């Protein structure tokens, strides 16, 4: 018969970079 | 004597991607 | 007798997309 199965493969590659983040209004003028 | 066994199963997913790179807010109100 | 243990499995899929990034305050008002 065939031999036993081989080993699991390696982890896949990293996922893509996330989306850009979301700043507040600037300071008031004096 | 028999032939090679089947390939192994797929690996797990890769790691989550890195965090993204936000824009400035609007100008402040007038004084 | 059985054959040899089999070849390596394939890589997993890509990981999930990253989270959103972290912006600055806007410019001061006039």
Author numbering:
A (entry chain C), C (entry chain B): 1 to 30
B (entry chain A): 2 to 32
What does the study report here?
At the molecular level, collagen forms a right‐handed triple helix consisting of three peptide strands, which adopt a left‐handed polyproline II (PPII) type helix conformation and are held together by interstrand hydrogen bonds. A repetitive unit of three amino acids [Xxx‐Yyy‐Gly]n with a conserved glycine (Gly, G) and all‐trans amide bonds is observed.
KGaARegarding the overall structure, the three peptide strands adopted the typical triple‐helical conformation, and no distortion could be detected, which was underlined by comparison of key parameters and alignment with (PPG)10.21 Considering the modified positions, ProM2 units were assembled in a PPII‐type helical shape (like all the other Pro rings) and were well‐embedded into the overall structure. In combination with the fact that all ProM2 units adopted an endo,exo ring puckering (as predicted by DFT calculations), a close packing of Pro rings within the triple helix was observed. The crystal structure not only confirmed the synthetic success of introducing covalent linkages in collagen models, but also demonstrated that the triple helical structure was maintained upon this manipulation. Because of their desired endo/exo flip the proline rings of Ac‐ProM2‐OMe were positioned in space that is also occupied by proline rings in a collagen environment. In the case of Ac‐ProM2‐OMe, no conformer with an endo ring flip at Yyy was found in the initial conformational search (30 kJ mol−1 cutoff), demonstrating the general exo propensity of ProM2 derivatives. A pseudo‐equatorial orientation of the rigid ethylene linker relative to the Yyy ring is sterically favored and thus controls the Cγ ring flip depending on the configuration at Cδ (endo for Ac‐ProM1‐OMe, exo for Ac‐ProM2‐OMe). Regarding the reference peptide, the stability was slightly decreased for the ProM2‐CMP or maintained in the case of the H2‐ProM2‐CMP.
